[PDB]
Amino acid sequence: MELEDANVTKKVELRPLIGLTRGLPPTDLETITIDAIRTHRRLVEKADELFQALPETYKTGQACGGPQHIRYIEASIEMHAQMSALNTLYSILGFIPKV
Amino acid sequence: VELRPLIGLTRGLPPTDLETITIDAIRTHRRLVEKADELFQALPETYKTGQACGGPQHIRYIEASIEMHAQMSALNTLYSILGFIPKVVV
């Protein structure tokens, strides 16, 4: 499928994705990755929106702890974890698809 | 540490909140394993033996598995940051 960036500084970070995707038809690996890209972008947007809605004392470090902060931290954890998977998919695919 | 960004992200968070997040992360891991397991069990036998692969249903199982593996890497990181795996009643 259309490419964004060829030759990636590949890093399989999530070992089990190799077995999971071994044997898949190319188009299905592509579908999975494109969907992961879109999930990636939504997760980033969520995390960033939560960070911005934080009271200004939280951003600066003044404040910390508490539900709201925890919700932000959880959304960022989801984003970082899913980005690991996305990087792994790029490694397996060999390129970064254009979306 | 499997997911290095988590160290910076959690720096300064009170220990109680860290431990609450990690306990919720165990619950989440257990739910994600359960879902992956449900989807695998529902796959046609050809796919459960690895004779066949691909198609939407198989894709949905792979995506559930990917979710589970990515979350687990977060959870293992949380353990390292916290210094322990908390007791969780299951």
Side-chain angles (χ1 to χ4, degrees), chain B residues 77-88:
Chain B
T77 300
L78 288 171
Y79 294 151
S80 293
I81 295 169
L82 177 65
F84 64 93
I85 295 172
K87 169 171 180 172
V88 174

Side-chain angles (χ1 to χ4, degrees), chain A residues 20-21 24-36 89, chain B residues 36 39-40 43-44 47 52-67:
Chain A
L20 276 180
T21 55
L24 281 175
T27 176
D28 284 346
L29 177 64
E30 284 201 339
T31 294
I32 289 171
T33 300
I34 295 160
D35 291 357
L89 294 164
Chain B
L39 299 182
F40 182 78
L43 289 175
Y47 299 82
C53 77
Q57 187 176 359
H58 191 216
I59 290 164
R60 267 184 258 108
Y61 158 71
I62 296 169
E63 289 177 324
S65 297
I66 290 169
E67 192 175 1

Side-chain angles (χ1 to χ4, degrees), chain A residues 14 16-17 20-21 23-25 28 31-32 35 64-66 69-70 72-74 76-78 80-82 84-85 89, chain B residues 3 5-6 9-10 12-14 17 20-21 24 53-55 58-59 61-63 65-67 69-71 73-74 78:
Chain A
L14 284 178
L17 272 56
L20 276 180
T21 55
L24 281 175
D28 284 346
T31 294
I32 289 171
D35 291 357
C64 67
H69 189 17
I70 291 180
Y72 162 68
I73 293 184
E74 291 179 332
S76 170
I77 285 168
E78 182 163 27
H80 288 295
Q82 193 267 343
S84 198
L89 294 164
Chain B
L3 275 182
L6 265 42
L9 177 69
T10 57
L13 190 60
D17 283 346
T20 294
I21 284 164
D24 282 339
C53 77
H58 191 216
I59 290 164
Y61 158 71
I62 296 169
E63 289 177 324
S65 297
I66 290 169
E67 192 175 1
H69 288 294
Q71 194 277 328
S73 135
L78 288 171

Side-chain angles (χ1 to χ4, degrees), chain A residues 1-10 30 33-34 37 40-41 83 86-87 89-99:
Chain A
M1 76 178 124
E2 335 71 48
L3 168 149
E4 173 81 311
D5 179 339
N7 298 298
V8 171
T9 47
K10 301 203 196 75
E30 284 201 339
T33 300
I34 295 160
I37 283 164
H40 171 65
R41 289 173 186 172
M83 183 70 230
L86 176 56
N87 282 149
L89 294 164
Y90 293 154
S91 295
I92 289 169
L93 257 186
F95 61 102
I96 299 188
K98 202 173 192 67
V99 191

